[PDB]
Each structure stands twice: as structure tokens, then as C-alpha cells.
Symmetry: C3
Subunit: 638 residues, 3 copies
Amino acid sequence: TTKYPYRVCSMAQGTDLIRFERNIVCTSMKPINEDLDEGIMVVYKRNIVAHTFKVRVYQKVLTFRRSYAYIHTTYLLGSNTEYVAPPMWEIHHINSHSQCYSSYSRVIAGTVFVAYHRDSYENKTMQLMPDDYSNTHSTRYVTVKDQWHSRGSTWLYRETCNLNCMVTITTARSKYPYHFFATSTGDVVDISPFYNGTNRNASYFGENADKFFIFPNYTIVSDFGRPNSALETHRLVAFLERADSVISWDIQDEKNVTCQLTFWEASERTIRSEAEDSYHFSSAKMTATFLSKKQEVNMSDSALDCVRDEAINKLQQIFNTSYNQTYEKYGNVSVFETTGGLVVFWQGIKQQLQFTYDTLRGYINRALAQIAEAWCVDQRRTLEVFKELSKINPSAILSAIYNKPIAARFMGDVLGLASCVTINQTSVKVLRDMNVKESPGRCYSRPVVIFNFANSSYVQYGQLGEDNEILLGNHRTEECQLPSLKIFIAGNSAYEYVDYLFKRMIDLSSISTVDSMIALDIDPLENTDFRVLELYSQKELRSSNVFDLEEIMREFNSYKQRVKYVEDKVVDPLPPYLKGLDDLMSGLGAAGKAVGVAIGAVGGAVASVVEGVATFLKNPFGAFTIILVAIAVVIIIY
Amino acid sequence: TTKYPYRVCSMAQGTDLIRFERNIVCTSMKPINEDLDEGIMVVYKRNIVAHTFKVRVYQKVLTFRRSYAYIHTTYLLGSNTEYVAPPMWEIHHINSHSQCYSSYSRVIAGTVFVAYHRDSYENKTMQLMPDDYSNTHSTRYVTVKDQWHSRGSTWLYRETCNLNCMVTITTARSKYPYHFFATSTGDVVDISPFYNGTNRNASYFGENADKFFIFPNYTIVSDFGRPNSALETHRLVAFLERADSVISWDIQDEKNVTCQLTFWEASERTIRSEAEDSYHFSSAKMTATFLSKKQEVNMSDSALDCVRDEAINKLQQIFNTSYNQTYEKYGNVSVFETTGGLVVFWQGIKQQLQFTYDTLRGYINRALAQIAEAWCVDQRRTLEVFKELSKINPSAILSAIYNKPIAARFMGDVLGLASCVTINQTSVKVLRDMNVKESPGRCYSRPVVIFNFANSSYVQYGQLGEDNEILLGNHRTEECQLPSLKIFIAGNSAYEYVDYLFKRMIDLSSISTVDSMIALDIDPLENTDFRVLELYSQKELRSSNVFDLEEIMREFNSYKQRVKYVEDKVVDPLPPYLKGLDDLMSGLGAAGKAVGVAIGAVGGAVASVVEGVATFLKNPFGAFTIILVAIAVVIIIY
Amino acid sequence: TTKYPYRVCSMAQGTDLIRFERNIVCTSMKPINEDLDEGIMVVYKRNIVAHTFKVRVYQKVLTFRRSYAYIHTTYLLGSNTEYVAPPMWEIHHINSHSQCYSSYSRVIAGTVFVAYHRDSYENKTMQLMPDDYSNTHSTRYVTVKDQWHSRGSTWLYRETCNLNCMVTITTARSKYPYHFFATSTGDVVDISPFYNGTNRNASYFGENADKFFIFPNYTIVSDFGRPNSALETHRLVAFLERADSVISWDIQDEKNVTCQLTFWEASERTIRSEAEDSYHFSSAKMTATFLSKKQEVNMSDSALDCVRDEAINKLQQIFNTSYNQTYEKYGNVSVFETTGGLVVFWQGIKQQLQFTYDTLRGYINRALAQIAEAWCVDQRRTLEVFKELSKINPSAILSAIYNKPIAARFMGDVLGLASCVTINQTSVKVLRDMNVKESPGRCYSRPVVIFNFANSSYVQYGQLGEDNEILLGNHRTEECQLPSLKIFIAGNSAYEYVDYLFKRMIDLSSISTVDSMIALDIDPLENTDFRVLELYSQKELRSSNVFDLEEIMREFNSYKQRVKYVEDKVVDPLPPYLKGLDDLMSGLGAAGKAVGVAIGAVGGAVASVVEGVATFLKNPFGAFTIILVAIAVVIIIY
Ligand SMILES: C[C@H](NC(=S)Nc1ccc(NC(=O)c2cscn2)cc1)c1cc(C(F)(F)F)cc(C(F)(F)F)c1
Ligand SMILES: C[C@H](NC(=S)Nc1ccc(NC(=O)c2cscn2)cc1)c1cc(C(F)(F)F)cc(C(F)(F)F)c1
Ligand SMILES: C[C@H](NC(=S)Nc1ccc(NC(=O)c2cscn2)cc1)c1cc(C(F)(F)F)cc(C(F)(F)F)c1
Ligand SMILES: *[C@@H]1O[C@H](CO)[C@@H](O)[C@H](O)[C@H]1NC(C)=O
Ligand SMILES: *[C@@H]1O[C@H](CO)[C@@H](O)[C@H](O)[C@H]1NC(C)=O
Ligand SMILES: [Ca+2]
């Protein structure tokens, strides 16, 4: 199954942005000049090359966790992490020996608080070792992989720190005009990658003054994790100290320039309707409809000399492709610059009753041009439709219209693209179970999977999706209602779960496609389900009533009811008006005209005293005192 | 940015209704008559003009609010509003002096309860002043804009009223045959606007008998709010006392009639396939396919004499547009009434080897007609697709297919249309923040905006949407996970929030459209995110696990789990079976055969006594008594 | 209204499976051979007939319910059902006399527990009577329709059983190659319906060995429910004892075989572009584009002799349909097998300046073929679009593209089809109310309906949907905000609810379709709503703020906020860290350096004692003891 390998792509950061431009206008191609020409043209747009240069990021996560230890259990009373960038000497030590210290020494506005890794009060060094989230364009070298659950002595509230020095090596990508590069994780900095010390006017720079360091001949270790690797001196290295991280990169070298060509497509039949100055290339591809101004762009122009020779030959071959001797060439090659920005160039071609033949050919050409002109609108319609379908599942739409497996994610108003991460591909066991072990009456919705990220030894838990791609998480449970005939696609083979235990594998042949079933299927059987009906017709339709199986329709008819559930449910365990007071309303609810005022005043005084009494009673020491005095009185009775 | 002004259109009442008719059928245009004609026709449908006449509505909102006042805080023990229509003399006073009373005097079935504005027990008068929700088709003149939070004396439960006399001036719209008009706010009445006293048979009337008043020469003030304006006597005014409002309007005058024409479109090439009686106008616009019966509609007909002359000239000009002398006219103009109801009229045109030319022309015409016939189906398909896309975002779909900014809202099964309200356009500050100030760890999803409704001085709070339109509310928060690169479109300029603090404005050029990127993009970068992965692989995937960023797909896989959350969460703080009883089950849960019965009986008696004891204990006076007796006993020990 | 009868189709089990195959490829039809032919062909695909044979299923549901009875109310302390298949002798008794016993006698691993229907300790017999869920393809004969709410003696915890013997008669459907048949309810078994005792190699069998019984001449009662019906001896009957049911069926007889033909369609104009071996039938239907290998399939083949004669005649008639004498036949009929698997057969046809005419005809044919070739892609695009629209409402999409009323439901990755159940059609009262009677401030979203399932006398409750089809449940409530103008479609007639009380019926003519309104509507009115605005601009936008009326858009902007509501709401009434302990954190929260440790230790000891004291206090007997000793001490004071 090399066609569809396991992939966990549901996450996509920046470095790629695409949009769905709203307004595109089609023309009205019947102003003048019922007579018209035809030739052979080839089309290509303008593109720019990006740059990838493998930045590095240093960071140090420190978290406090305070807890209390009972005799048999240990309660955690909350925890809080925070990220702080390391000082410069620590970064020098990291880049020189691939080991970092275990004592952070920040100062907060009046004095220093020397934190420690394990409250051991030592200045030791810790190595770096690989982490369990690898890629082809990412790596980590965290130094404390585990978490510390030290129970400690009973009845002793104590707090601990977990300094977790880390280095990561991502790959960034910047585009023209090269004045901000976004890394793989998501960090964005407004500095040109080509900015060395003395290129302020030529290359952009807008970050800060004393947050920038350029080092020449910086001895950097080749690969972290190995205790003693081999060093290698780079030319220039740049550091960009931020408030919570440190970014570093190699000062890149000057860019190569060849030209901007794409080779969009090469057509074979075009139609030209010259109105007055707006030569229309009504191409017969039914997807190309351009416009240009009636001026040759001077083929000997100083912006396209790479394709200058390559411009001619292809046209010639396409001529010899189909126009051997019946069709004769007409003039030299011509070059037109369109309104969009793409250069398109073409070669003209041509071939009593001769007048009749010419009239027939002209009429047919006019008909075809008008048909294409009317066809122009469905492209606008399709873009409009996709602009709304992309709100349901961007990944599917983009992968369908690009013919590549692509993971995309919304970023407010513009999509962000990325490829798919690839799992080990060897150890992925699909459990033959769907029932939640702990909870009776609830079973998973999609089979649970246990994959393993590359170059690691730590298992995970995800759930199978469509086309054999893993989606993260283990929380797609659902109440479930026997019998069931779930079938999951892993093309070209489908799993068949019957009553939630893995009946058998089935080859994908006994499920007729709707496309091949446009004709009359014999007859639907009109089946029924009795558990759901018996549950509805006893009025406890709360949880198992429906699972919204036809989701996006049946789901929005119920949401306004869940909102009321949540509101009413929240109001009761939400701080009331001093629940003891809640009776007074009922006291006035029944009857009473003016006794209510005096009753309210007396109740106010009484409640003022009793609330203090109860507040004293709630502390354990006060409760013990009450118990002691009660026992003492009872003993005194004797 | 005059192209896209700020607008707050997310609300749309009636007065406009549109539908998505399901079944439209395409024909089979090859019965007979392979030979066929062609001409030039122009098409227009039938429309009717509406009527807008600026009704007025009087109302009086009165609300009770009861509260208790502690020493440092004031609790509100609920409140309730209610709307009541004012009596007739109050309306006369309002329309004569633009000031209304402050004492409502309803009777409830046995006696009168004279309410008062502030329990001041006076019969004063209050002026009317403008409200903070204006429009081009709405206004209000509320008399008490604020709310009364009078603390009052401590320890005194008291209730207050807030009589809030109001008048509003909307604009209604009614359509043929003029027998019900719906106002802007949403009120609908079944009375023809032309119904004066003596038009029962000619104009509809179906509301009631003693709920209608017609006044001649009613002295009405010109504009409320000004203490002394200039009066103006209208001809007839009508009042329609309802149970909770009073509607009034001017008795309109008799309608003008000219004709019903639309000028749908003017084509240039048509194709006619006369089968036996069903002349088919297979127009070359690829969107027009009509049918009619083989009978001229008698151009000298008494329903279209306005366009009678205008019918001919346009055809002539289009002839001179393209048919100078090669194409000769054929007969007189002809008029056909289609099956839909639209009248279409046309002028016929025409021009050894002549037979060959005729055969070629006929074959080409047949081919084009068949192509259009096959094209007829995609319109049905597109309507079917839009019928389901309209369930995702009606406003976007309707604005796309109408090329106007339109706000629409479902009304059960039929859409309701309206334009967009326009804000002051001058003072709209977009805050450069996204973090919720009070709650740490939660930050907004779209930037928060502070606009200002026209002709007011009271700020509001809304959130920015797409294409620079404000959507109401301040509640789109979300847990959020650094780093972020949010980009919001305000065409043609996009805001860029990096880590939720307003990095900088960016011109909309560095985001390549997918339409212009049909070709091969270089390569996606395969990025990753470590915070989400570390959160998943420790099994606390509850709140920050996912935000359903690719919403409508990832959202319905989780809904059945939120349902279980809500159910289990509700069950516990929901009235149990007298929680003291809950132990008995466990008492029988472990073991026991027949001791359970006796234990249950004894527990029943004990619980019967103890519940009464606890009910006595819960009142503050009983608690104070218990405290007093305990202290007295302890003192007595001494 | 026979066009749209009431139907309750929202449920669909298996027995029908369809799929949405992803990749379909269009060709490039310009390799070679600019010259090309044309003929007349007819097309039909391959289909297989299914089998329906009316299985039977026996089952016995037994449920335990334990409860306690107070003096005025009766609490139920949970209940649990379970399904168990009956033994063989009980099934023999059921099939011989249509009455079943009331005493289940299972054994659990060490001894028998004889359950009883009502703890009456008797071995009586109970009849079978019809149930209130009937169909054309389902029935039930449950023996205990009601539920037992016997109050019993006060203060006596007791449990009861409700044995509910049942038999059902569904209809299954199996398809080629007949090796698993799925019943209507949802049960699936992997046995060929034709498997009698001695067909192991010819017919599949994969269930088990000692879970199968074949009985010859089994005297089976004709119809259950009647105390004494007429018997009828079938040939062979098969039982398939499962763990919780018993399935039975008649051993079917050998299948008939005629042929596999469908008669897809009969075209009239085709275009053939023979490249080298891949004759392309570029049909002019604009939906047919095939491919085959250059070899006749030997019309005298032993797989299609049924249509062998019928193959010729239709072609002939279509010739006489349009080709009388101008068009002459060319050779004999030819038969081509396509790549898909469908056989298509065709008859060729044909008809100085002759060369010119031939060139014109060839050029036109090439143009039309290229247009169809370019058209091939929109079918792929439409399938891609429907693959995502089917995630919103499968029923609507399938019913639109099949032109039949079809209820479909997702089954993981493949759709399941069924027709619509039909209600009595006579007694369906649509209540003229929408306000929830018990709850003030909440009113239904769609009108509530009271239908009645066929052949029953037990009312139900459902809600009206679109196109006059009932959807089950009574839980689509919503907070609601006057005024309202709801209009519900029951084509061709719409209900109009104004302020939620059934204003009047309206014929469907005063709502203009968007399809007929492509032109300029006069002007939208720009209406407004004041209740919603006043609710927003006072900051209590929690429940009535919005109902997500434009659902699928406004709904996913709020979901991440409901998630936080649920999380925060759950955390508080979720088992805390022994709430008495919660103070210690605040004790260390303010200040303290080392007194916290000693305070924590003392608090630990005190809490250890006090928790035991409170646990003793929570039992009713301990509370009564405390009350007794307190009263005794107070009396002793005297
Ligand atoms: C009928 C009477 N009801 C009272 S006195 N209701 C009440 C409740 C609350 C407040 N005030 C505040 O809650 C408050 C908060 S801040 C300021 N005031 C004031 C009055 C009653 C009194 C007794 C007694 F005499 F034994 F106490 C027992 C019962 C019994 F047996 F039915 F339970 C009933
Ligand atoms: C094991 C025994 N358990 C009992 S007696 N359980 C029980 C609970 C509830 C009910 N009945 C109702 O709740 C009821 C509601 S309406 C009608 N009846 C009846 C019985 C037990 C008794 C004592 C004692 F003697 F001190 F009380 C202390 C403990 C201790 F130390 F473990 F806590 C345990
Ligand atoms: C300020 C002082 N606060 C204390 S002592 N706080 C505290 C709370 C909890 C724990 N420990 C555990 O909860 C625990 C669970 S497991 C192990 N330990 C330990 C200490 C205080 C003491 C009194 C007194 F003396 F009357 F009691 C009254 C008040 C008053 F008037 F303000 F209410 C305040
Ligand atoms: C280079 O940068 C300097 C900044 O000091 C600027 O003044 C100058 O115009 C730029 N260009 C050249 C050619 O020096
Ligand atoms: C029939 O089934 C038997 C199973 O014992 C198998 O050995 C045999 O090959 C099958 N076919 C024939 C023709 O006997
Ligand atoms: Ca199309």
C-alpha cells in the first residue's frame, strides 16, 4: 500500500499562504470585427524561487508544581510553566559542548532567585538527548524527557521545579522581496536572511538595535546528542535575542538569478478577436481567456533572454506535429504581455467557392468563440462554490484541486499549507476493539490506533481516518446502539466492524459506486431500527436519543437546546445570592405586606452573625475545637 | 475604502421573502422538423411595484425588579418585564405634545393597580428623547434611557418599577394584491393599506371590529423630541389596537398603473425548433430555453400598450447593429407568450452550391441547438448545489449571486432579505489586543471593535469579520496556543497579528491566490507544532486539545462527546433521590439477603425524622436558636 | 397531496451500500488520425439481481429494576436490561402454538437462577400480540407491551423483573456471490442462503459447527397473534443460535439465470476517433466517453444470447427514426467491450466540391469531439463537490440525484440506503402552538406533530420537517424572541406562524423564487430588531444572545466558547482535593515561609480525625444518635 502511507497530517503552521480572490470578471467579446484570425501560442506565467536555510532556536522551559502528600494518595494543587530564553554564555556552552547547565539565575527588579532543577542546590551540567517528535524538517534535543512525581514525606506541602533546557533545529522559508522569514514551528521575524552588518539600505532590517549579534568564525558542534562530536566553523552566525527564545541562523550568500518562467501550458488552437487594441486569445482549451494591448513587447527585451531561443523551437515542433504542408505559416513569431502579468507568444497560421469556404470557416470560428465566451462564467461559479466548501474541510478540497496530499489550516482569513508527516510505517497496530474499557455503554466512533513517531521508542494513541491517515487524539467516543455494521475505508481495502468486534477484512468490490449507479437500482428495502424507536417513545431522549449520524444537518437543530442545558446547568453550581438568603424570596413569594420588612431586617442581623459562625466552623481547627468541647461537656455530665 | 464600508448586517426581518424552488425540467428537443429557423428576439418578464408608507408604533414597557441590600453589596432577586399598549388618551397626548405620562393604570379582573415610574406616587409628564439605535428606516423616542440601580437602605427587601414609554417610526412594505403589510421591526397585520371606511369589497380587511379607529384631520406633531414642534394635519389616520402595541398609519391614496415590464435581456442570435405547436427559442446565450404555444398574442392587446411602440425600435437597431445588407428581414414582428408568464417578441431574419451551403448551415445549427439542450441540465445541478450551500452562509451565497451586499436570514423554510446597516464610519477603533484581560489563558478569536451607531453617543462592542463588516457581540473567545500568525482580511488590506499583538499592516500582495496557482507550487514545507503534540501525549486532551480550527469537519466528530459531558455533568447537581438515601443502595450493593428490608424500614423512620430536623435547622432563626442553646448550656456548665 | 405523503424516514440500516469513488480520469483524444468516423450505438451495463426471503428472529428481553417507596413518592434506584436467546424447546413451543413461557432458567457457572416474570413463582404461558412499530418489511409480536410501576409497600426496597418474550419477522437481502445476507434490523450472518446440509464446496459457510440446525418438514404456525391459526409445513428450516438471539430462515431454492442487461441508454449520434487500438466512442450525449480494444467480442458469444436478437432491431428502428434514404448503412453491426465492463454495440452510417464538403464535415466533427473532450472534466468536479455536500445532508443529495425519496445514513465511510416509512396518513394533527407549556421563555423551533404508526393505537410525538416529512423527537426547543414570522413548507402549501400562533394557511405563490429573480429586485428595506440589540448592549449575551439562525457559519465561531463553559462548569462539581484541604493553599497563598510545614502537619492530623467523624455523622443512624444525646443532655440540665 505504497499509494497511501500512514500520515498524521492535521496540523499546518505558516511559511505558506494562499487566498481565494473574490472578483474575477469575464468579458463581452462582440464589439467589432466579425472577421478574426487564428494561430498557435504557448503560455507561461511568472514565478519566484523561495529560500530554505535551517534556523536554530534555543529555549528553556521551567515549571513549578506544588503538591500535598496524604498517607495513601498525593494531591497536586496546581502547576504553572513558563518559558525563558537562556543567557549568552549558556548558549556558547551549548554550541561548544552540547551540554547545558541546571541552574537558572534570573533577577526580578530587586534581587536574584537562583532556581534549581530538583532543589538539589548544585551547578551540574546535563547532556542533550533526542526527543520523540521528529520529522524531515524538525528535531529536538530536550534534556529532561520525563516528569517528576516524587511523593515525598506525608503531610508536607512542597513545590518543585523542572528546568527543561531545549534546543530545536527547524527550517525556515522566505519569499520575495526577502524581508521576513517564517520558521517551521511558527516563529516569524522581520529581518532579511541576507542582512549582514553592512547591508542596511540594500536589505531590510526592522527588529531592534541591542537584540542582534553577528559572530564570525563561530565554532559550532556538528550534531547535538553525541557527547563529543566534530566541530565546524561557519562563516557568519546571527543571534536575535527575544523575550522568551533565542533564534540563530547562518548569514546566507547572494542569490542566483536566471529568469522567471513557469511553462504553464502549450495549446494547439487559438482564436483571436481583435476589437480595437485588446487582442483576445480565445483559446480552445476552454480554460484560457486572456487580453493584451496591441504592442509587441520587443522580444529582444532585457528580462526574458533565457527563454529567448527556447521560445521559437517548441512552436516549430507543434507545427510539424500537425501542420505538415496543408497549413502555411504567417509572418514571424509575436510576443504579447497580458493584463495579468504573464507573457504569451504565438505564431500565425493559415491555409468562386473559395469565398464560400471562407464564410463557412468564419461562421464556425465565431460560433466556437461565442461558446467559449459563454463558458467563461462557470469558472467564477466554481470558485464561488469552493470558497464555501473550503469551510467544511480545507484539506480535502485542496488535495482534490492540487492532486497532492496536502494538510491545510485556516489562519483567520488565509489558508496555511503543509505536507503530511510520515509515521514509522511498520509498527501501527489497529486494535480490533471499539468499546471503552472503563465506561460501560460507550464505545469509540473510529478504530483506535497505536503508531510510533520516527526515531523514537514511545508509543502514542490516535484514531484511523479516511484514506488511511491517522488523526491525533483518543476522544472520539460515542454512546452506541446495537446492531452496527461500520465499514472504514483504507483504500483499496475496507475494515468491517460488526457489533464493534472486527468481523473480517473485505476487498473493495462489493460496494457499488454511485457514479456507476446512475441508472435504476432495483429497490430500497425500507429497513427499521427498534432500539431507537423504543427509546424515543418513552421520553428519555437525552443522550442515546440520537448521535447526529447525518451530522451537519441534524446537528444544528439541537445546538440551541444544548445551550439551554449548559446555561441552566451552570446557574445552579454558580455563586448564588448567599443560599441562606434564597428562602426570604419564598417568604415574600407566598404572601405578606409589611411584616416582610421587619422579617428581612431580623434575618439580616441573624445571617450576619451566623455567616461568621459558619466561617469559623469551616476551618479544621475550629471543627476540632467544637468536637473537643462537645466531648468534654458530655464527659462532665458523668 | 469606500468600496467596503463598515456594516453590522447580521439581522434581517421580513418584508422580503425568497425561495429555492426544487423541480425545474429540461426538454427533449428532437421530436420532428430537422429543418429550423432563426431570428432576433428580446425578452422581459413580469414584475409588480411595492409600496412603502412609514407606519408608527406606540408601546410602553414596564418592568419590576426586586432586590435586597447587604451592608457592602446589593443582590438582585430576579426581575421581569412586560409590554402593554397605552390607552387612547395617552396616544392623543403623545401625538399632540410629544410627551407622555408616568403612571400606568391597568385593571386586572377585579380592581385597579396604579403603577408608578419610581414609586414617587405622582402623575408627572416625561419628554421623549432620541435612542441609540438609529437607521435610515427606523427611529425611537424612548423616555427613560438608563436603568435604576438605587441601592436603598440596608436590610430592606424592596421592588421598583421602570415604566419606559416609547414610540417608534418604521417603514412597511406590502406587495400585490395588497392585503397584508409587514413593518421593518417584524410586525405583520392583515389589513390592506388602502382600506378606508367604505372599501370592504374592493380592499381586504380581516383583523377585528372594535380594534380599529379612523380619524380625519388628525393634528400630528411633525417630529418628536423637540419640546414644541410644528403640527401638520393629515387626511386620514388609522389605529389598530392590539393586545400589546398600537399601530398607526396614514390611509394611502389610489395606486398608479402603467404596465408590468422588466427588460430582462436583449439577445442577438436565437434558434427556433418548431415541433408541432411548441416553438422553442433555443437562445444562444446558453441560459435561455423557453417554450410557447403556436398563437400570436395580438400585439394590439389591452395589457402591454406601453411597450407597444418601444417593442419595435430596439429590434431595428440591433439589426442595424450587425445586419446591414447581407442579412434581410423576414416578415413582420411576432409576439409569443411563454409558459412561465413572460412575453417575448422577435423579428425573423435570413440571408447548385446554394443547396450545399444550406445543408452546412442547417447541420451547424442543429449541432449548436443540441449542445445548448444538453447544457440545460447544469443549471438544475447548480440550483441543487446552492440549495445546500445556503445552509452554511446565506449572506455570502446571496451576495455572490446578486452582486450586492445583502444580509439574509432563515425563517423556518424561506429566506428573509435586507440590506446592511451603516455605522458612523468615522470612530471605529480596532483594538490592537486579543488577550482577555480578566481570564489568563484565553484570548479572542477575531479582533474586538468599538463602533458607534449613527446619531448617538453610546459606545458598543463588536468583532471584525471578513470584507470589513462588523458582527455583533464580544463572546468569540478561545483558548489559544503560541505561536500564532493570524491574518484578517479588510480588502484590500490585511491585518497581521503575531502572538496576538498587532505586528503590522500588510498590503494584499504577498498572498498568492489559488486561482493563479493552478500550476505546481514549489514544495510544501511539512511544518509541525510541539505544544499541541505535548498536550496530546500526556492525556489531558479536554480544553486546549483542539480548537476545531478546520471547523465543520473536526467539529462533528466531537459533538457526541460533549453531549455525554453535559449529561453526566448535569446528573450530579440535579435533584437526587434524597442523597441520604443513596447509601442504602451501597448497603445492599455489597451483600445482605433479608436484613436489608428491616434496615430499610428503620432507615425510613430515621430519615423521616432527620429530614424535618434538618429543614428546621436550615432557617436562620433555627440556627440562631441552636447556637443560643449550645452557648447557654456551656455557660451553665460553669 | 398524494405527491408528498407523510414519512418518518430518518433511519436506515444496511442491506444497501454505496460509495463515492475518488479518482476518475479523462483522456487526451488527439494522438493520431485526424480523420474519424461516426455511427449509431446503444449502451447498457451489467447488473445482478438480489434475493429477499423473509427471515425470522426470536429474542427474550429481561430487565431488572430496583426501587424504594416513600410515603408519597417512589424513587427508582436504577435499572438494567439484558437480552438472552431462548432455548430450543421454547422456540418449538413458540412455532407450534404461538405462546411462550414466563420463566427463564439460565445457569451461571455454578448453579441455576430461575427468574420469573413478576416474582409470582409460576410457570404460566403468555400469548403474543402485535406491537406498535409496523411496516411493510417488519413486524413484532411482543408479549408484554406495558411497563410495571407497582408501588408496593412503603419503606421496602425491592426489585422486579419484566421478561418480555418477543418474535420478529424481517426481510433480508443478499447479493452476488451470495455469501452473507443482512436483515432489515441490522443483523448480519456469514452464511449463504442456499446452504443446505450438503453444499459446503458449492455454497459458502463460515459461522460455526454446533450453532446450526436444519429441520425438514417443520410445522410452523402461519401467523402469530391469533390463538389458534392454521399450520403449514415448510421444506427446510434453519436455525443459527447466537449468543443473544436466534435467527431462522427457509432454505431457498436454486437461482434462475437469464442474463445481465440494464439498457442504460440509446444514443443517436456518436463520434469515433480510432487512435491505434483504442476506439473512442465520443458520444454526443455529453456524458458518455468510453474506450475499448480493437477486437470484436464475437456476437455469437456464450454470455449474451438473450439480447442477441434484441441487439439488432432497435438500431434498425432508430435508423428508420431519422435516416430514411439520405444516410446509408455501412457494414454489419459491431460489438465492443469497454474498459469498465459494459458491452456497447453500434451500426456504422455514412452519406470537385465533394472534397470541400468532406473537409467541412471533418472539421466540424473534430471541433465537437474536442468540445466534449474538454467537457469531460466537469463531471469529475461535480463528483468532488458532492463528496463534500453529502456530509451536510445525505438524504437530500441522494434524493436529488436519484429523483426518488431516499433516506440514507453514514456507516463510517459508506452510505446505507432505505426508503421511507409511511404513517397512517389520516390522523396526523399538527398542533397550532409552539410555546413549551411547562417552561416560560422557551418555544419550539418546528411545529410539533402527533402521528400514529400503522396498525396501532398508541400516539407518538414528532416534529414537522421540509417537504412534509416527519422527523422523530420532541426536543428541538429554542429560546425565542418576538416578533417572528416563521413559514414552513409543506408543498405546495406553507404554514405561517406569526408570534408562534398559527396565523393562517398561505398558498405558495407570494414567495418569489430566486431562480425567477435573477434580475434586479427593487430594493431591500434594511430592517432592524431592537430586542436583540438591547440584549447585546447590556452584556448578558449568554442564552438569548443568538440562536445561530444562520447556523453552520455562526455556529462554529461559538463552539470553542461552549467548550470552556463545559470545562469550567464540570471542574467545580467534580471530585476536588478534599475541599477542607483547599484552604491550605490560600494559607500558603498569602505569605509564610516555614510555618506552613508545621501548619500542614497539624492540619493533616486534624483532618484525618475530622473526616472519620464526618463519615460517621453522614449515616442516618449516627445523626439520630447525635440528636438523641444532645436532647438527653439538654434534658439532664433540668
Ligand atoms: C414560615 C417561617 N419562615 C421564615 S421565618 N422564613 C425566612 C427565611 C429566610 C429569611 N431571611 C433570610 O434568608 C435573610 C438573608 S439576609 C437577610 N435575611 C427570613 C425568613 C418559618 C420559621 C421557622 C422558625 F421559626 F423555626 F424559624 C420554621 C419554619 C419551618 F418549620 F417551616 F421550617 C418556617
Ligand atoms: C455498615 C453500616 N451501614 C449502614 S447502617 N448503612 C445504611 C445507610 C443508609 C440506610 N438508609 C437510608 O439511607 C434510607 C433512606 S430512606 C430509608 N432509608 C440504611 C443503612 C454502618 C453503620 C454505622 C452506624 F451504625 F454508626 F450508623 C456506621 C458505619 C460506618 F462507620 F462505616 F460509617 C457503617
Ligand atoms: C488564618 C488562619 N488560617 C488557617 S489556620 N488556615 C488553614 C486552613 C487549612 C489548613 N489545612 C488543611 O486544610 C489540611 C488539609 S489536609 C492537611 N491540612 C491549615 C490551615 C485561621 C485560623 C482560625 C482558627 F484558629 F480559628 F482555626 C480561624 C480563622 C478565621 F477566623 F479567619 F476563619 C483563620
Ligand atoms: C545606503 O544606505 C545609506 C544609509 O546611511 C543611505 O544613506 C544611502 O542612500 C544608501 N544607498 C547608497 C547607494 O549609499
Ligand atoms: C466438494 O467439496 C469437497 C469437500 O470435502 C471437496 O473436497 C471437493 O473438491 C469439492 N468439489 C467436488 C467436485 O467434489
Ligand atoms: Ca458546469
